[PDB]
Design a protein around this ligand. Structure first.
Ligand SMILES: [Mg+2]
Lengths: 208, 241, 490, 287, 252
């Protein structure tokens, strides 16, 4: 297909509320959610649940880029996740990068969504993440590989929604143009359709 | 250089089964509730015990059942020849704190001082080998000077293995040689170990030897310490009336 | 052994590392059915009798032969090589890791390769009854073996047989006769012998040397036979023709090999030897020498000519590759041929591959590239290749020496006969045919005759071509260089 | 957040089942849980899961200026992280005691035992040497870490391969995994810890305790061993009074346990190499 | 390596140390002189009170985050964070610091606690934040004055204002006390000094000093000279505050 073999697995870990291992190709992320739980008077806010994301790679320590990425994920989830139901409590999303082969965010987002699902957390709509790489010649590639990201001039991670296939998040590396943005966004929408079909298949086989 | 001459002697001039003369004292600092000092050779530890007192910034940690032992470690910069910085906060001083804490929480018999801090503090001024045991023993003398109840002298010392023999109360030289060194701390009256640290490679059948050797060294340390303590108590009582 | 092997391969710089991943990639995937798209420029000889001769237990079989009779009394002979060039196209990493590994080492037990076993025994090789690519050189000849018409064509063939030398000889002259192979082999061995004696009359010299190849219950000595001379003559003819062609077409960049003839200050030892043994020799040229060695026979020493042949091989210089531009020698002492270039075994050499490329572009079935004409880069790779062949020789010698050490360790043989080659003041070099081994023996007051090379002790005298029995004691004092030692008795 | 408290019911039930020599899942006292060793795609990744406790291990390399005292041998950098997914209480910068003790223990065990060859990994004596760091991450927390952390560090450091290097004088040339074949490490012996837990002041002892057994235990004896019966480290924590015969017996146990774990590890590496020599980027071993 | 900032180089030395020249010396001037001062209060918006002071190459901000819940025990507090921008001074220093920033912070706190009256601000901590955009001479004094302006602006109570002044010593054969000097007169100097007082009630609030040398009488003359300088400076700050209050009256 236009994008590569990608699988998932739910309820791996016993201690966290919900967990999900989402791998595509050779990149594999692992997400664990701690549902509505305690929160101190400093971190909390009435009429909303505090969503906190902490992402940590498997090398060195977390610096700044990961903090930016986890802000992106935080706000995306705040966009979809319902929090006016569970005020004065904290939802926590932990992300670990078992492997890194490009298309990282496009994997972390999917894993976060699946974990939130497994934790039975009230969501307004599923979301997904894809990554499209524009080489110099304009030929785009979906769900790229690290080689394709290095040999390319632009890369674009889009976090889309399921209800109306809008654009919840966009993180771009490189420099690109308008028309290319639009066309890669359309291709991302198609890829998101495929990802949603996959989610439904996985959950169908989980409830069986 | 050498560790065990073919005759049986060491560098310092002592056989394997003996140790260096500890010279101690109890009552250094009066602004406290308990203090001690010890020199187990060139080493020079210094202990302090601020007694069972109130918790401030309660922060919901005042155990209601028993007392709260808080022991802090410190190795001065000029202790070793190689100057170092950040004596506190390091990942090793905190391990020493944990060790001392789980020892004295075992010995210090906290069930009688509930909701109270026993603050132990240890500073090592000079280090030439055997840096944990000197501190254990100084803190013991401190506790005792502070009239804090405690099951028994928690006496500590170190042993090692060289040329198919066991050495007692290693120094820095054979501690740098890399050989197996086993530090421990036991309660003599009962024969029970309160702590058993150890770091190097060696066979298993060669374990009982260094183990009993360290134990016997700790017994000797017990004798010396208790003679000191008895002198101290006698002098104090005589002075009272 | 698994330590000494790697140690000698690290000291002689012989690269032993396995093939990197990138290399394996550029190889073809191995569903490999002959693609009829590349077969355009080539032809189809599948309707042909071919019988590749192969020594005991080989896998990088590359050559192939045939001798098809023709209506006109003439017959078409043909040699066939594995057209590795198609697989090994330049600019890759394959080509670089094959250049550095400028030749395939063949130690007494293993073989360090230059191209994977896949491309060496499954694709390029001329395996039996499997259609494989090839380069081909075809001649038309008569029963006196003078060329009449030649051609140098790429093609695809199908080896009907992968024989052994003994199997070859028995298929030839066991009285069996068949339209398939045996007749080809016979009519080809004929031309082989004719060409052989023809070139001997041309002055080219034959030699010998102590060569022992281990299994290791008891070692064995290589045995000569017709089939070997046959295949050798045909392959040499192919090399010479290819060289003449790529020379006439290319006079600036090429790969040739020369054998710089020796200064006459080296033959004097052999001269003095045969003089003290009253056999005259003319060492002025190659012919005189050769036609003389065949006369120096005398019945007292039926095993004599071989000794002079060794004593000669101790003199010849080093044969080296080079480019037609940076030099102008173009003369090969040994074969008495002026031009000669290796063309048969690319699986076993890289200069063979470069020759395949040059010849193919001369035929027009390939495209050029800059590193094929830049004399500088070609000279550099040629120097590398010579250095590497030299390393390989040294390594194989060290290995056979180690195996001899080991065998003498397992079996302590003593007091075996031996002949003499040299005679020096301090030591007396010696040769043992049984084990195919030459060694030294020191004597550390003597009498050293140099006008006539001989040694004199108060009791006896030592001249070349005498006899002595020896006891072989290996000293292992220094585990490094566990060294043999000869003790003498009579 | 905080860990849910422990009820007196569970505590008493556990103590009694110990008195009667009954574990919970159904195993004896001298038994581990099914430990699985799974590998990744990148040389140096290993996920080892004993029962429910999963731990990840990555191994990375660098070239750096060595330290003056040791200009010949290289460097090694351990680190263990307690990911918040391991358990709620593992907030960043809060459970520091556990981090400190685990990291010191692991450093001691592997480094000071001289498990690997810090000399083999020299390139330019005085200017540039290797630097091997190993990051362990705790994913699920059900009971025994030290054993898992150690098995992971070992499987990694035995399933890792360096970028080959050539050298002449001072000219050093690094190369990529696609240009040459990475070179493995140099191990002398693989140590892996073994954890005993004491109940009722020393009367009862268990192996591979779960999380509850860790909440109702008073003492922990860690013992590092090899397949050659070589004590590498031993530690007592929890403020507990043990004796001699106890440590002797625990050591005679750790012997067999480490022998078996080692056999498994070797089998796992064998299977992974076999797979990659057939097409496949994984490797799996089961107790 | 810091994991809260961008990955830069390990070490980085400036180019000046690699220069080759005898830098220019100031020379002569009127020792009892003061640089032209631009002081304005009310610069910043998002802060309850702010002030800005420029004197030569000196350029300092100060903001006051007001009372924030956190007798002699229910007595207010004020914690001051002095901070020089990494782009001030010949050399660059990472933002954290840890050597002189904290010393000058202690100085500011010791010079402000007296003026401010904290009995009327119990159970509260005033966060004073100074920022040095450019160093061109007397810095700690500018910071005291700016913090005073910011406080008086936010409307915290007081007893009097704080005026600072920095002095240096000429290393010539006849050493004279140089008033309100420049970074050049300060790096080519033998001794330095800093006074800070409350001119109405004529009381020092915090001073400081240091010396390649000196002697009692010299230090005393320096002190009194700095006092006179601070007196001569007070009216500028007075007018600045009046002006800001007029602008506020205008806004509403
Ligand atoms: Mg052949």
């Amino acid at each position: 297909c236009s994008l590569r073999h990608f699988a998932c697995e739910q309820n791996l870990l016993s201690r966290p509320d919900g967990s999900a291992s989402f791998l595509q190709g050779d990149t594999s992320v692992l997400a664990g959610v701690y549902g509505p739980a305690e929160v101190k008077v400093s971190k909390e806010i009435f009429n909303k649940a505090t969503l906190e994301v902490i992402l940590r790679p498997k090398i060195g320590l977390p610096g700044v880029a990961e903090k930016s990425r986890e802000r992106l994920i935080r706000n995306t989830c705040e966009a979809v996740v319902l929090g006016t139901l569970h005020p004065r409590t904290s939802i926590t999303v932990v992300l670990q990068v078992v492997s890194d082969a490009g298309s990282l965010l496009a994997c972390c987002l999917n894993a976060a969504c699946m974990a939130l699902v497994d934790a039975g957390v009230p969501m307004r709509a599923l979301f997904c993440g894809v990554a499209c790489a524009l080489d110099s010649d304009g030929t785009l590639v979906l769900d790229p590989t690290s080689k394709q990201e290095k040999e390319a001039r632009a890369v674009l991670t889009f976090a889309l929604d399921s209800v109306e296939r809008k654009l919840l998040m966009s993180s771009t590396k490189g420099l690109y143009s308008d028309t290319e943005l639009q066309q890669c966004l359309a291709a991302a929408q198609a890829a998101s359709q495929h990802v949603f079909r996959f989610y439904r298949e996985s959950l169908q086989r989980r409830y069986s | 250089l050498e560790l065990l001459s073919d005759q049986g002697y060491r560098v310092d001039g002592r056989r394997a089964g003996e140790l260096r003369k500890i010279q101690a004292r109890m009552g250094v600092f009066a602004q406290a509730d308990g203090s001690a000092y010890i020199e187990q050779g060139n080493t020079k530890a210094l202990a302090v015990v601020y007694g069972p007192h109130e918790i401030r910034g309660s922060r919901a940690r005042a155990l209601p059942d028993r007392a709260l032992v808080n022991c802090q470690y410190s190795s001065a910069t000029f202790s070793t020849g190689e100057r170092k910085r950040r004596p506190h906060g390091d990942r090793k001083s905190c391990e020493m704190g944990l060790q001392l804490r789980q020892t004295f929480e075992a010995a210090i018999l906290t069930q009688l001082h509930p909701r109270s801090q026993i603050d132990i503090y240890v500073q090592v001024l000079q280090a030439d080998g055997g840096t944990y045991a000197a501190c254990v023993n100084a803190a013991t003398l401190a506790v005792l000077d502070a009239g804090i109840p405690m099951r028994d002298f928690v006496c500590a010392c170190s042993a090692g293995f060289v040329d198919g023999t066991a050495l007692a109360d290693l120094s820095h030289v054979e501690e740098a040689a890399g050989g197996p060194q086993l530090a421990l701390a036991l309660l003599p009256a009962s024969g029970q170990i309160a702590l058993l640290e150890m770091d190097a490679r060696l066979h298993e059948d060669h374990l009982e030897r260094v183990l009993e050797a360290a134990a016997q060294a700790a017994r000797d340390v017990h004798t010396l310490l208790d003679r000191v303590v008895r002198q101290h108590v006698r002098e104090a009582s005589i002075l009272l009336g | 052994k698994e330590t000494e092997t790697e140690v000698l391969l690290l000291e002689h710089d012989v690269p032993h590392q396995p093939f990197s991943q990138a290399v394996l990639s550029f190889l073809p995937k191995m569903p490999w059915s002959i693609t009829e798209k590349d077969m355009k420029n080539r032809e189809d000889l599948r309707h042909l009798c071919i019988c590749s001769v192969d020594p005991p237990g080989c896998t990088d079989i590359n050559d192939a032969l045939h001798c098809r009779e023709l209506e006109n009394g003439n017959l078409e002979v043909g040699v066939h090589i594995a057209d590795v060039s198609h697989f090994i196209r330049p600019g890759n990493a394959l080509d670089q890791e094959s250049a550095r590994r400028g030749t395939t080492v063949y130690l007494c037990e293993k073989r360090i390769d230059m191209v994977p076993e896949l491309l060496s025994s499954n694709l390029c090789s001329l395996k039996c009854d499997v259609d494989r690519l090839a380069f081909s050189c075809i001649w038309e000849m008569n029963h006196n073996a003078e060329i009449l018409k030649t051609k140098f064509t790429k093609s695809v063939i199908n080896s009907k047989a992968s024989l052994t030398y003994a199997e070859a000889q028995l298929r030839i002259d066991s009285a069996n006769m068949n339209d398939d192979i045996t007749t080809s082999l016979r009519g080809l061995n004929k031309l082989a012998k004719i060409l052989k004696k023809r070139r001997i009359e041309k002055g080219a010299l034959t030699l010998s040397s102590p060569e022992v190849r281990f299994h290791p219950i008891d070692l064995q000595t290589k045995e000569l036979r017709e089939t070997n001379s046959m295949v050798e003559e045909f392959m040499l003819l192919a090399n010479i023709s290819v060289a003449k062609k790529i020379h006439e077409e290319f006079s600036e960049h090429a790969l040739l090999r020369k054998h710089p003839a020796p200064p006459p200050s080296n033959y004097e030892i052999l001269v003095k030897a045969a003089r003290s043994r009253n056999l005259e020799i003319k060492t002025d040229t190659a012919k005189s020498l050769a036609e003389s060695l065949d006369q120096a026979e005398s019945p007292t020493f039926p095993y004599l000519n071989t000794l002079l042949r060794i004593l000669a091989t101790r003199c010849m210089m080093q044969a080296v590759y080079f480019c037609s531009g940076m030099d102008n020698d173009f003369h090969h002492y040994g074969l008495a041929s002026p031009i000669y270039t290796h063309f048969t075994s690319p699986i076993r050499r890289y200069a063979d591959v470069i020759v395949h490329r040059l010849l193919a572009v001369a035929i027009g079935a390939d495209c050029t590239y800059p590193e094929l004409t830049d004399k500088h880069k070609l000279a550099d790779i040629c120097k590398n290749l010579n250095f590497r062949h030299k390393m390989a020789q040294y390594a194989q010698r060290a290995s056979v020496a180690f195996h001899t050490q080991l065998f003498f360790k397992s079996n302590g043989i003593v007091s075996e006969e031996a002949y003499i080659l040299f005679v020096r003041k301090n030591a007396i070099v010696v040769l043992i045919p049984k084990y195919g081994l030459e060694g030294t023996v020191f004597f550390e007051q003597l009498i050293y005759d140099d006008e006539i090379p001989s040694l004199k002790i108060e009791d006896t005298v030592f001249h070349v071509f005498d006899k002595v029995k020896v006891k072989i004691m290996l000293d292992s004092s220094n585990l490094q260089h566990q060294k043999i030692r000869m003790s003498l008795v009579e | 957040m905080k860990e849910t408290p422990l009820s007196n019911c569970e505590r008493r039930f556990l103590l009694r089942a110990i008195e009667e020599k009954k574990r919970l899942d159904g195993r004896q006292t001298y038994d581990y849980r099914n430990i699985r060793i799974s590998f990744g795609t990148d040389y140096g990744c290993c996920i080892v899961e004993l029962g429910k406790t999963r731990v990840l291990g990555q191994v990375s390399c660098e070239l750096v200026s060595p330290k003056l005292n040791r200009a010949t041998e290289g460097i090694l950098f351990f680190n263990l992280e307690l990911s918040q997914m391991a358990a709620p209480a593992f907030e960043p910068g809060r459970q520091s005691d556990l981090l400190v003790k685990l990291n010191r223990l692991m450093e001691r065990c592997l480094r000071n035992s001289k498990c690997i060859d810090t000399e083999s990994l020299c390139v330019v004596a005085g200017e540039k040497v290797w630097q091997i760091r190993v990051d362990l991450h705790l994913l699920n927390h059900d009971g025994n870490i030290i054993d898992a952390a150690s098995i992971a560090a070992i499987v990694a450091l035995c399933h890792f391969r360096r970028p080959d290097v050539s050298v002449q004088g001072d000219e050093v040339t690094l190369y990529t995994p696609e240009e040459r074949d990475p070179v493995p490490l140099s191990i002398h012996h693989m140590p892996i810890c073994v954890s005993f837990a004491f109940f009722q002041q020393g009367t009862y002892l268990l192996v591979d305790p779960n999380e509850r057994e860790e909440r109702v235990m008073d003492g922990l004896l860690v013992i590092a061993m090899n397949k050659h019966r070589e004590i590498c480290t031993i530690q007592s924590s929890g403020g507990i009074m043990l004796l001699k015969d106890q440590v002797l017996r625990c050591s005679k146990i750790a012997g067999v346990k480490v022998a078996e774990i080692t056999e498994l590890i070797l089998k796992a590496l064998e299977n992974d190499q076999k797979v990659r020599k057939e097409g496949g980027k994984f490797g799996f071993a089961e107790s | 390596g810091d994991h809260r900032r961008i990955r830069g180089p390990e070490e980085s030395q400036p180019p000046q140390l690699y220069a080759a020249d005898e830098e220019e010396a100031p020379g002569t001037r009127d020792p009892t002189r003061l640089r032209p001062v631009y002081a304005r209060a009310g610069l910043l918006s998002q802060a309850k009170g702010s002030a800005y002071l420029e004197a030569g190459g000196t350029k300092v901000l100060c903001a006051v985050s007001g009372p924030r819940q956190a007798p002699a025990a229910l007595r207010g507090r004020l914690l001051c964070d002095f901070r020089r921008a990494p782009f001030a001074g010949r050399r660059r220093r990472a933002p954290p610091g840890g050597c002189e920033e904290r010393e000058l912070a202690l100085a500011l706190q010791e010079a402000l606690e007296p003026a401010v009256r904290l009995g009327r601000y119990p159970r509260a901590q005033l966060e004073v934040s100074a920022l040095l955009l450019e160093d061109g001479g007397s810095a700690l004094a500018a910071a005291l004055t700016a913090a005073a302006l910011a406080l008086a602006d936010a409307g915290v109570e007081m007893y009097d204002l704080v005026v600072g002044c920095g002095l240096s010593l000429a290393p010539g054969p006849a050493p004279t006390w140089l008033l309100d000097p420049t970074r050049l007169e300060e790096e080519r100097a033998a001794a330095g000094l800093t006074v800070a007082l409350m001119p109405v009630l004529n009381q020092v609030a915090g001073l400081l000093g240091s010396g390649e040398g000196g002697l009692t009488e010299s230090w005393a003359e320096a002190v009194r000279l700095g006092l006179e300088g601070c007196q001569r400076l007070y009216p500028v700050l007075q007018q600045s505050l009046v002006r800001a209050a007029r602008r506020r009256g205008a806004a509403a």
